[PDB]
Amino acid sequence: KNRPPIAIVSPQFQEISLPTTSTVIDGSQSTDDDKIVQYHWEELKGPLREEKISEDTAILKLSKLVPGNYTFSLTVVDSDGATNSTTANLTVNK
Amino acid sequence: DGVGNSSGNWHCDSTWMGDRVITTSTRTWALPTYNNHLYKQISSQSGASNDNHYFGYSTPWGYFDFNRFHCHFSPRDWQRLINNNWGFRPKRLNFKLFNIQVKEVTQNDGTTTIANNLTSTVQVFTDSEYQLPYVLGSAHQGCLPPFPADVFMVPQYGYLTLNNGSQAVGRSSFYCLEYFPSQMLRTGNNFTFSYTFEDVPFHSSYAHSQSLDRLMNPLIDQYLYYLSRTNTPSGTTTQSRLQFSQAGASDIRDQSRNWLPGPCYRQQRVSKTSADNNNSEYSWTGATKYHLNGRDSLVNPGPAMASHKDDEEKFFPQSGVLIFGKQGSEKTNVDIEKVMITDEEEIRTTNPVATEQYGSVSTNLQRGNRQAATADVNTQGVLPGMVWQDRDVYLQGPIWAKIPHTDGHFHPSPLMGGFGLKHPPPQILIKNTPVPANPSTTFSAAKFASFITQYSTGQVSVEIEWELQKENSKRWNPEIQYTSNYNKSVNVDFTVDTNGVYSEPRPIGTRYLTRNL
Amino acid sequence: HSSYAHSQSLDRLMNPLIDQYLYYLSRTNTPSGTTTQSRLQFSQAGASDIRDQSRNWLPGPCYRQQRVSKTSADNNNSEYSWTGATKYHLNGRDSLVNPGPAMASHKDDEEKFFPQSGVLIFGKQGSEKTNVDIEKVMITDEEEIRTTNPVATEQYGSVSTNLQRGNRQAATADVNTQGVLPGMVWQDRDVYLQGPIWAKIPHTDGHFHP
Amino acid sequence: HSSYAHSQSLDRLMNPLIDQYLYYLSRTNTPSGTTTQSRLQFSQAGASDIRDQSRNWLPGPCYRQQRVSKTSADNNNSEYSWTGATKYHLNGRDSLVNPGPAMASHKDDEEKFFPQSGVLIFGKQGSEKTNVDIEKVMITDEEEIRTTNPVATEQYGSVSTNLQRGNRQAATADVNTQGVLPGMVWQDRDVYLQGPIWAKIPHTDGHFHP
Amino acid sequence: DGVGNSSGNWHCDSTWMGDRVITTSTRTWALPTYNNHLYKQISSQSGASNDNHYFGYSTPWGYFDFNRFHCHFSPRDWQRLINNNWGFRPKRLNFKLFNIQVKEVTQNDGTTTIANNLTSTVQVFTDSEYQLPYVLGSAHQGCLPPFPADVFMVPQYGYLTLNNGSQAVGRSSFYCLEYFPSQMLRTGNNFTFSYTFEDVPFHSSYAHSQSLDRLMNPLIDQYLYYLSRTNTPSGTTTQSRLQFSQAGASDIRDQSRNWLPGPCYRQQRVSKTSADNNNSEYSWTGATKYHLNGRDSLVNPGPAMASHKDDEEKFFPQSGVLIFGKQGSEKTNVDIEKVMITDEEEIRTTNPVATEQYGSVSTNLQRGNRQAATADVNTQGVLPGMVWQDRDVYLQGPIWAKIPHTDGHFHPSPLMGGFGLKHPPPQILIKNTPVPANPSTTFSAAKFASFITQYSTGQVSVEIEWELQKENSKRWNPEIQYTSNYNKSVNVDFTVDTNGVYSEPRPIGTRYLTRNL
Amino acid sequence: FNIQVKEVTQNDGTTTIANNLTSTVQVFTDSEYQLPYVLGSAHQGCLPPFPADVFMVPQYGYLTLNNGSQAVGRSSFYCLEYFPSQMLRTGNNFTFSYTFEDVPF
């Protein structure tokens, strides 16, 4: 009986300064009693006009970040289905 | 033999011959009862990540491991090895178990009383046909101690199998180790076997005194032509004349030859200094992580490459260097001063730097309007014309590893360093025979769950014969050799402390002498 | 010919019970309450961190194929047959590799996926010479060499691209062609009851693993 | 030493008269009048589709050079000599490969092109030590190993980069460095009447195809 | 030998030769003191039914039993046996007792202290002349365990005799087992004997690829005539013309031949599904119950018949099938999911279905006024022209049984499956020698009642050589073979759990290959 | 013995039968009993009772396991060209000998 899939994210505070606006958030630390099939990243907060890279992997890659406060949500799916969602906070100061 | 008769003597010596050294070791071991005499399925049922799932079995069996170089060489005998020899390889070994004592323990009101058990046996067999999983060569703890006065505990045997997450597959094998013929040993009995190593190459215990790009005469030019200049200074403009030159001394980078450096697989560069590193969690996200069956795995250390370039000693590859530990260093999250990072700076002559590119191949086809654009070669497989060196062996690194029985394998040197062996020295498996406690006077068809709690101890001897390869150098000036610091210190290196704790201060490699390419 | 699968994978060849005596990349900063300070920590790996203890051996070489689904819905609605092919180039003319180097057809529990030109495709009885459907063919499978060979539709690894310092980050790559490195072990392609038996090695100066 | 050319290329080693019994990547959609539906079709190749029947063997390894023309007009008006070089990196210092791995100098019917540092360049009589023109030198040619070795100024192939599904397309790559894979055959470099005879193999632990 | 010397080694292996397999097993046993060293008359004095009365004796003796196929075959070696061989039989065995340790226990204030007793013996003899009751072959518990790491308890020996209710008869024999010459064994001593099996037939480890009623050419008719039609359609009436036909294909049921199916003894049909069974207590009232000396007894399983017909797999004979158990299943009143019902569906070709009739013989003598009436053959003894198959052997079923020394016996195969032996492997009887406690310093002519409480333990080895019968089939298409499921599961079958408990998931038969009739 | 292979032609409804001197006839024996034994089921097509009669050789065929009209996985298929058979032109002949076991009278 699989409980859900207990997800955890590589650090929830990721302070960034200009000019180098490129970060990496990871979800390879997400655990379960069996393999995690599906990963899902979704932007919650932050400014607009950013191209996204690999929304369906365990590792985020971002480029050309407008300075603000981004919030993402790692979502894992069990096999068979059980869904857990945790968040991660970004802060891009000048 | 009997109870009051010794079944062997303490042989711990090393004899140096003209091209041989026979290192004999003897240690005292202690074998407990593992799993309470049970085989237990183990897995990642308690919530592991996708890369961290395993499935396997834990056995009641112990195994003897002597796959470290300090198990056989003292620091003085290692110093005799590395300052006088261009090569070494093992030839034969000889293994002994003797003076076996089985002790039983009792729960006398919280005060444990330990007594002999003279009629209890200890089962020993060898995996001489290689029909169990070969756990050795994965660089695990529980080998023979470096210092001969230390008593060690025999590690529990267990193996992994095929897994689809934390679950198994139909192709997963289960091995009962009592389905093997094992010699049963009371006190007075002893166990011996001999093993002969196959014809392995010598380990290169020499640095190179020449680099791969400096293998020529500076005095004499070449008769070939190269890329000198692709235009002319015509006062104001250019006209693309496509000129050609020769290179002997002044333009020495682009005379080139028959040979290329070895293959690469680029690591990150991490500084010894904490200030020159990033303030991010680039440990796994910046790792090298080979991908296999849908799960990633750090390469650690991967292919043999140089740790750093000239005069950058504070830099090391992220997972490209063996990292040993100091005395008493904890199991997890220890600082940079609690570890000892080794160094592969002797193979800068032929192997690339691990934290850098291999080269820069072309990407486009240049014509009159667009320019030639290069690339950044970060993974280079083996090309014809490549020469390279393997990874250095260390006094506390492994000796061998089993080459996996596969269809294809190329240059079977173990990536943690050592001797690739198709038939390695076999696993030596040991287990206390279960002595049951008081059974009921009525019959029960269930298995026994109540046993007399007992452990065994004894002495173990390993005797490996090594074949040496002597230096034959015509070098005039003296060579770099491993020496001890002859200054005043609180503790002498590679000795015991005031508390009687043996320690090793630094990793000693083996490439101190030099040979030309 | 190796008519055996492997009961162990190349990345699972060790004792889970015993830790290693080596150190690896554990952590490159500290949680200092609010900020980080780049401490460059080091750990041991026996069981709980089993991905980054590593060894003497590497998986075999790769040459990445596309991934085509058995299900027609999960494939693209475009003509990616030749434009998405693997196509080695020789004397100014291209040629599909078909099947190329021996790699695994798919990873764990994705059986509906097959490499585009990396698998021998036989036919059923009476199947026509041209443009036959997916049910008229029999796609073979190389799922037994997932232990040593890479998956054909995936990367080999991710090497580094830059030299990290205090301002910029470490950027990796995507290894799609990996030539043979020292320390690689691999398996050849499976033989079949209706596949070929031999082939002539060409009389050349150089040939590797014929 | 192989003092023979090959009368056959590596991609033309089969019978045109007879089809294969394997199946390949024929078509990944249908012309359905107006739209497509991703049927994932499969074909056989004997003659008419000869590029994507494939075999047991691959061309040799590569390390891409620039292409320089014999004609001075078709070259660039820039100093791309060292900046566009191939330059292996060793102990923190770069070095031109010159000539590097044995590859073909050019493809079919492009004889005015030569690799930038991939060909031995001898000299004529009385040619000076430095900065001599294109007519004072004699550029050799490796056009006989076009059958097995790749062209030095071109790619090895185009591996995949992504994992295609219903929304994004399959994207390939450009293989510019290819290490040796199993199944590669190649030829060494030609010897010349005024080229060298031997060379000492360096006394190293590892060397491949010396 | 002595105290501190081992008297034997652990031999647990199986070696496969060209037509031999030599399966060696070794287990650890534990022998208590039974009945406090007494012979006890036992009976049904405590109120049993007429079918349940017995009279016999319980002895202080233990016996070694290895009459199970898992005692000798691993599940892998059983799989090698059944997928490659049309037959097997045992040829010789070899038995060993060694490393015998006698432990004494003390009543130290509720805390039992177990110590050695180096001068105490253990008596062992073999019933090599078959002059004791042969208890083996009645499928009792307490054999060697399936898994070699398990310690088992030696079962208490006891036998039954003649009884008239719960009372005895003058013809009832009493056997004192100390009236046999037995070898006395301290520690350091060991016990061995060898045994040679008689020429037994091979066990049929093949199914039939043809049925008994389908053994002919469909293309060709017969030259015989049969019962086609006994009247005519004459428009309105009939006139009894007594017609005759030939049968090749279209009327294939009533061409017939030289051979008949085997004998029958009809069982009830019980469903696996609880809904399709009756809501009554038809267990004993609907049983098959042979009658002997005025008392009934369930046949269980009786003659070898097919369990069910084509495509009715949910049905099983009531007492016609061996029913094993799962791990940890209780002694009484366990549910249908706690048991494993075997299956005899491979002998549907020659043996009748157990839950059905044999046939329908005639009852009357038909003439012009009355009709021909048939019957329902429920018991069919053996007729000339019958061929049949014996019952399948299983990995956890018995191996042999003693044929009773009688005047008459027909086809002496054991009805629980196995090898009928007139001289089976002998009983191996073991007993702790009574060590008395402190006697009084005055003489008493009474027997001793106070003994030192002690038990013994040790290792036991059995080594049976088997003779194989290789397949010689010209079958084109592949054959059905026993395979493991190669899908993901929590536990691998025929392995241990996380708690270290070995289990067997299903009964493995031996009829997987095929031969023609 | 005296094996003659005749070929026939569809010459406009008039069949012309000619020799074929280079055509063979394959013969083998099931001497190891590894085919289904159809004989003993009392079928037609034996040797005639009267020696002057020419008979037709019956077609070989066998039955297997069946669950209705369908088959079972245990059903064997036998290709009879997977047996070593002697090939016989005209001029060739086939012989074998067989010894009965000790059967009762």
Give CA torsion, residues C13, C16, C22, C23, to 10 deg: 120
Distance CA B457, CA B30 (A): 4
Distance CA C29, CA C44 (A): 17
| Among A residues 65-94, those touching chain C with beta carbons less than 8 Å apart | 79
Cβ contacts of A31 on chain B, cutoff 8 Å: 47-49, 52
Concatenating the DSSP letter of every residue in B205-259 gives -EEESS-TT--S-SSS--S--EEEESS---SS------EEE--SSTTGGG---S-
Mutate to test the interface with F, among E220, E250, E471 (most CBs of F within 10 A): E220
Q: Pick the residue from chain A with its C-alpha nearest to C33.
A: A13
Asked how this structure was determined, the answer is cryo-EM
Q: Pick the residue from chain E with its C-alpha nearest to B166.
A: E490
Q: Pick the residue from chain D with its C-alpha nearest to C122.
A: D22
Residue among D155, D178, D186 minimizing CB distance to C179? D178
Distance CA B289, CA B320 (A): 12
- CA geometry: angle D171, B268, A16, nearest 5 deg: 80
Distant-in-sequence, close-in-space partners of B384: CB < 8 Å, separation ≥ 6:
C206, C208, D60, D61, D101, D102, D180, D186, D188, D208, D209
Cβ contacts of B42 on chain A, cutoff 8 Å: none
Residue D190, helix vs strand vs coil: coil
Q: Give this entry's resolution in angstroms.
A: 2.8
What tokens appear for E314 in the block? Answer: 């949910």
Cβ contacts of C167 on chain A, cutoff 8 Å: 20
Contact check, Cβ <8 Å, B165/A30: no
E414 contacts E116 by C-beta, under 8 angstroms: no
Closest CA to C12 of C62, C55, C60: C55
Residue C95, helix vs strand vs coil: strand
Residue among C27, C36, C56 minimizing CB distance to B401? C56
Cβ contacts of D87 on chain B, cutoff 8 Å: 253-254, 359-360
What tokens appear for B218 in the block? Answer: 């500076």
Residue among F43, F67, F73 minimizing CB distance to E217? F43
Q: What is the DSSP letter of A52?
A: -
AA identity, residue B352? P
Contact check, Cβ <8 Å, D202/B215: yes
Contact check, Cβ <8 Å, C164/B269: yes
Residue B71, helix vs strand vs coil: helix
Site of tokens 């990874």: B391
Contact check, Cβ <8 Å, D58/C88: yes
Distant-in-sequence, close-in-space partners of C159: CB < 8 Å, separation ≥ 6:
B264, B265, B266, B288, B378, B379, C172, C173, C175
The answer for E14, left when phi > 0, alpha when psi is -120 to 50, beta otherwise, is: beta
- Cα dist. E258→E255, E261, E360, E384, F33 in Å? 11, 11, 19, 10, 19
Contact check, Cβ <8 Å, A59/B280: no
Contact check, Cβ <8 Å, E26/B164: no
Contact check, Cβ <8 Å, D153/B365: yes
Contact with chain B for residue D176, Cβ under 8 A: yes
- CA geometry: angle B495, B499, B503, nearest 5 deg: 35
Residue among B221, B244, B371 minimizing CB distance to D80? B371
AA identity, residue B367? R
Euclidean distance between the first and the last CA atom of chain B, given in angstroms as a whole number: 58
D61 contacts D180 by C-beta, under 8 angstroms: yes
- Sorted by where each starts, the structural domains of chain B and their CATH numbers stand as 1-517 (2.170.30.10)
Contact with chain D for residue B249, Cβ under 8 A: no
Residue among E209, E221, E472 minimizing CB distance to F76? E209
The answer to whether E and D touch (≥3 CB pairs < 8 Å) is: no
Other C-beta atoms closer than 10 Å to the C-beta of F31 total: 8
Closest CA to E469 of E209, E202, E208: E202
C20 contacts C50 by C-beta, under 8 angstroms: no
Closest CA to B87 of B205, B198, B200: B205
Contact with chain D for residue B240, Cβ under 8 A: yes
Cβ contacts of E4 on chain B, cutoff 8 Å: 1-4, 118-119, 186-188
Distant-in-sequence, close-in-space partners of E442: CB < 8 Å, separation ≥ 6:
none
Contact check, Cβ <8 Å, F64/E219: no
Q: B431 vs chain E: nearest CA distance in angstroms?
A: 11
Phi, psi values for residue F8, rounded to 5°: -125, 150
- Cα dist. B73→B340, E63, E87, E282 in Å? 20, 55, 58, 79
Contact with chain B for residue C62, Cβ under 8 A: no
Burial call E426-465: b when 16+ CB within 10 Å, e when fewer: bbbbbbbbbbeeeeeeeeeeeeeeeebbbbbbbbbbbbbb
Q: B201 vs chain C: nearest CA distance in angstroms?
A: 15
Contact with chain D for residue B360, Cβ under 8 A: yes
Q: B47 vs chain A: nearest CA distance in angstroms?
A: 4
What tokens appear for E309 in the block? Answer: 């017909």
Cβ contacts of B284 on chain A, cutoff 8 Å: 10, 26, 28
| Among F residues 12-51, those touching chain E with beta carbons less than 8 Å apart | 32-38, 40-45
C41 contacts C27 by C-beta, under 8 angstroms: yes
The answer to whether B and F touch (≥3 CB pairs < 8 Å) is: no
B221 contacts B162 by C-beta, under 8 angstroms: no
Contact check, Cβ <8 Å, A20/C109: no
Q: D68 vs chain B: nearest CA distance in angstroms?
A: 8
Closest CA to D20 of C138, C121, B420, C108: C121
Task: Name the helix (H) or strand (E) containing D93.
Answer: strand D93-95
Q: Pick the residue from chain D with its C-alpha nearest to B220.
A: D129
E334 contacts E325 by C-beta, under 8 angstroms: yes
Contact with chain D for residue B294, Cβ under 8 A: no
Chain A: list its partners (3+ Cβ pairs within 8 Å). Answer: B, C
Other C-beta atoms closer than 10 Å to the C-beta of B221 total: 17
Q: Number of B to D CB contacts under 8 A, please give it.
A: 280
Contact with chain F for residue E481, Cβ under 8 A: no
Euclidean distance between the first and the last CA atom of chain F, given in angstroms as a whole number: 33
Q: Pick the residue from chain C with its C-alpha nearest to B329.
A: C43
Mutate to test the interface with B, among D98, D154, D188 (most CBs of B within 10 A): D98
Residue D51, helix vs strand vs coil: helix
The dihedral built from the CA positions of residue D18, D20, D21 and D27, taken in this order, carries a sign that is negative
The answer for E272, left when phi > 0, alpha when psi is -120 to 50, beta otherwise, is: alpha
Closest CA to D183 of C183, C62, C89: C62
Contact with chain E for residue F75, Cβ under 8 A: yes
Q: Pick the residue from chain D with its C-alpha nearest to B226.
A: D117
E388 contacts E211 by C-beta, under 8 angstroms: no
Mutate to test the interface with B, among E6, E109, E114, E187 (most CBs of B within 10 A): E6
Alpha-carbon Rg for chain D in angstroms: 22
Contact check, Cβ <8 Å, E148/B1: no
Burial call A35-65: b when 16+ CB within 10 Å, e when fewer: bbbebebeeeebeeebeeeeeeebbbbbeeb
Cβ contacts of F77 on chain E, cutoff 8 Å: 475-477
Residue among A11, A13, A20 minimizing CB distance to C169? A20
Other C-beta atoms closer than 10 Å to the C-beta of A18 total: 10
Q: B100 vs chain D: nearest CA distance in angstroms?
A: 43
Cβ contacts of A20 on chain C, cutoff 8 Å: 167-169
Distance CA E28, CA B120 (A): 12
Distance CA E130, CA E137 (A): 14
Distance CA C183, CA B403 (A): 10
B465 contacts B91 by C-beta, under 8 angstroms: yes
Cβ contacts of C109 on chain A, cutoff 8 Å: 35, 37, 79
